[PDB]
Design a protein around this ligand. Structure first.
Ligand code: 51E
Ligand code: OLA
Ligand code: OLA
Ligand code: OLA
Ligand code: OLA
Length: 408
């Protein structure tokens, strides 16, 4: 009994249980909330099946401490390894498919704007110079400012990843373009006259604004004071009429007509320009971890060595640890890539922060656990902390919005 050790002078096993109990309660609360309000846009706009898998993994996480703190039975040694191994694999491998999907969607977004300016501004598959004599390639992508033609080729090879000999492809030109877009977005957000407009527009209309920036510069776009106010107040027709009067429309009519049309409709008309699959992939990544766990059951049969000490060796811990490490690594990779994505009330900003801490917690875990003389309790807290972070940073903010902000 955990109370006995508490009265003998050891408050560790009673603390881990209470932690786990509060964890299960919090996960039970959050889960019921999503069941009731499944039709509310904050829950509907995200993958709901994946969340249930993430919530289940967190639940099993807290249940682990009941297997590390238990009566000495044989199957509890089995439940430990199955629990400490599969629980992270259920949450993280479901989260990676979610982040990967967010990464592909974002990549396809950068694909559209790339095609937009390929049509409006043009493209060169070999090295040239701008109006100021600096070496340039693709859609106006500056390579270097040295007169050396060799200097531009060296910078190009570092950016592409091969020996290009001054010649690239459309895809490789898009690679360089993605940088220039991100650089342009930075400037807009650091511009007081362009930032409020950019924040209000949808995905398509933001590309149109960037298009204007790539033609006239930030100082130039800020000149459209009235038209920018119209776009911000979502008065598209008036903005269009207003923009058709500018010197910009009259100096470059063909291109300006396409940019304006994009503002009007919010579509790509002026330019020629799976849920089930996610569950299967998530299921596959979880089965791989199970295969590792089952194989280690055969190689090294679990056996009993309040505290329940099992004969689980280092390899029995390291192998499922490393695989979970890969899942976490892939999650953080795509999460960082989509950190600024504002979908679902900036949902992606919360996922990135979780993976930042998760990486730290799991990295710090290795020297702490393997260097500990209190492994069971250290495992209990590590698991619950890992499960608490994913629960507190990803779900609690959405639960708060759904209960406190019914008008948002
Ligand atoms: N060896 C080892 C090891 C080390 C650490 Cl630091 C955490 C865990 C862990 C994490 C989760 C878990 C489950 C859901 C979630 F969202 C986060 N973590 N469940 C069980 N064990 C295992
Ligand atoms: C809300 C608070 C609920 C959280 C925990 C309360 C239950 C704690 C159970 C510990 C009992 C251990 C024992 O019976 O030996
Ligand atoms: C109410 C909460 C109850 C928690 C009860 C579980 C505590 C004891 C389980 C671990 C053990 O076997 O010692
Ligand atoms: C959760 C249950 C999922 C898997 C449990 C299967 C474990 C069986 C592996 C065989 C163990 C052994 O050979 O000793
Ligand atoms: C940031 C992603 C998550 C963190 C990565 C996970 C770390 C697991 C990978 C390798 C751990 C190193 C191998 C274990 C060291 C064995 C120590 C020992 O038994 O003496």
């Amino acid at each position: 009994s955990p109370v006995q050790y508490l009265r003998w002078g050891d408050p560790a096993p009673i603390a881990a249980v209470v932690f786990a109990c509060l964890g299960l309660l919090a996960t039970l609360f959050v889960t019921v909330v999503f069941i009731i309000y499944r039709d509310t846009p904050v829950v509907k706009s995200s993958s709901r099946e994946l969340c249930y898998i993430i919530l289940a993994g967190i639940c099993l996480g807290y249940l682990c401490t009941f297997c590390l703190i238990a009566k000495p039975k044989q199957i509890y040694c089995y439940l430990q390894r199955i629990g400490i191994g599969l629980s992270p694999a259920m949450s993280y491998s479901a989260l990676v498919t979610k982040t990967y999907r967010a990464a592909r969607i974002l990549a396809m977004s950068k694909k559209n704007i790339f095609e937009m300016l390929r049509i409006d501004e043009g493209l060169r598959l070999k090295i040239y110079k701008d109006t100021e004599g600096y070496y340039t390639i693709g859609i106006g992508h500056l390579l270097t400012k040295s007169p050396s033609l060799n200097a531009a080729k060296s910078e190009l090879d570092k950016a592409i990843g091969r020996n290009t000999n001054g010649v690239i492809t459309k895809d490789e030109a898009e690679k360089l373009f993605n940088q220039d877009v991100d650089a342009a977005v930075r400037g807009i957000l650091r511009n007081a006259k362009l930032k409020p407009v950019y924040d209000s527009l949808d995905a398509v209309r933001r590309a149109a604004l960037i298009n204007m920036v790539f033609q006239m510069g930030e100082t130039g776009v800020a000149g459209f004071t009235n038209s920018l106010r119209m776009l911000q107040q979502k008065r598209w027709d008036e903005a269009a009429v207003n923009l058709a009067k500018s010197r910009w429309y009259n100096q470059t009519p063909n291109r300006a007509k396409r940019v304006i049309t994009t503002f009007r409709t919010g579509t790509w008309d002026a330019y020629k320009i799976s849920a089930c699959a996610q569950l299967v992939i998530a299921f596959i990544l979880i089965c791989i971890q199970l295969g590792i766990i089952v194989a280690l059951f055969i190689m090294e049969p679990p056996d009993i060595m309040v505290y329940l000490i099992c004969n689980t060796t280092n390899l029995g811990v390291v192998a499922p640890l490393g695989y979970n490490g890969l899942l976490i690594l892939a999650c953080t990779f795509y999460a960082f890539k989509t950190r600024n994505v504002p979908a679902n009330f900036n949902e992606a900003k919360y996922i990135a922060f979780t993976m930042y801490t998760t990486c730290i917690i799991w990295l710090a875990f290795v020297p702490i656990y393997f260097g500990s003389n209190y492994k069971i309790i250290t495992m209990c807290f590590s698991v619950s902390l890992s499960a608490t972070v994913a629960l507190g940073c990803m779900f609690v903010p959405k639960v708060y919005i759904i209960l406190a902000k019914p008008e948002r």
